[PDB]
């Protein structure tokens, strides 16, 4: 801390004490409902540009692994949240336009 090999007599603040955590606690609601993304992405007919559909989705668990896995998506850009860390986050509501 003093950047020297000789320390003068006195008291010196060198580092800080922290109690390290022992184990990780992961808590999510224990709902096991499959999520309706399949009918959103694989619908036979998609709506018009001005009359874009809006699907309110709630009470499900979402892996997004199929969304990662499918290479049919030519364009995949996520802005507010990075795409990889999506399954670790629980959200209030999601809309699929």
């Amino acid at each position: 801390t003093l950047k020297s090999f000789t320390v003068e007599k006195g008291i010196y603040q060198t580092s800080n004490f922290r109690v390290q955590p022992t184990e990780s606690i992961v808590r999510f609601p224990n709902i096991t409902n499959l999520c309706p993304f399949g009918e959103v992405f694989n619908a036979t007919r998609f709506a018009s540009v001005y009359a874009w559909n809006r699907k309110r989705i709630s009470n499900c668990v979402a892996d997004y692994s199929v969304l990662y896995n499918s290479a049919s998506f030519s364009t995949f850009k996520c802005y507010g949240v990075s795409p990889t860390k999506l399954n670790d986050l629980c959200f209030t509501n999601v809309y699929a336009d």
Partner: protein
């Protein structure tokens, strides 16, 4: 959590150190363990006798390297107690004096730097 302070004398004198964990109890810290209001002090022996402060710690506790020699912890001594022999008809008038010279040093200037 809390700051970690190391209490040591000069390195030419000894390499023994005493560690103060500031603002914590002596439970979470992973013998010679003492507990002050400044935090948990480990490595300093508690001494009932009071001396002049050498290395301040906090809350009236100061540390020193004394006797075989080890780091000790003690309450500050505010000076030798001296009662006055006060009375309503008693006076103490000096009969002899000494001429003492004291050295007072004050800073005046510093390095006239320019960047």
């Amino acid at each position: 959590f809390g700051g970690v302070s190391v209490i040591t004398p000069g390195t030419n004198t000894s390499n023994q150190v005493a560690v103060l964990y500031q603002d914590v109890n002596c439970t979470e810290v992973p013998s010679n363990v003492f507990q002050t209001r400044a935090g948990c002090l480990i490595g300093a022996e508690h001494v009932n006798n009071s001396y002049e402060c050498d290395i301040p710690i906090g809350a009236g506790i100061c540390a020193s390297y004394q006797t075989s020699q080890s780091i000790i912890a003690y309450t500050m001594s505010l000076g030798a107690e001296n009662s006055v022999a006060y009375s309503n008809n008693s006076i103490a008038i000096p009969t002899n004096f000494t001429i003492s010279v004291t050295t007072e040093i004050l800073p005046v200037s510093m390095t006239k730097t320019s960047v």
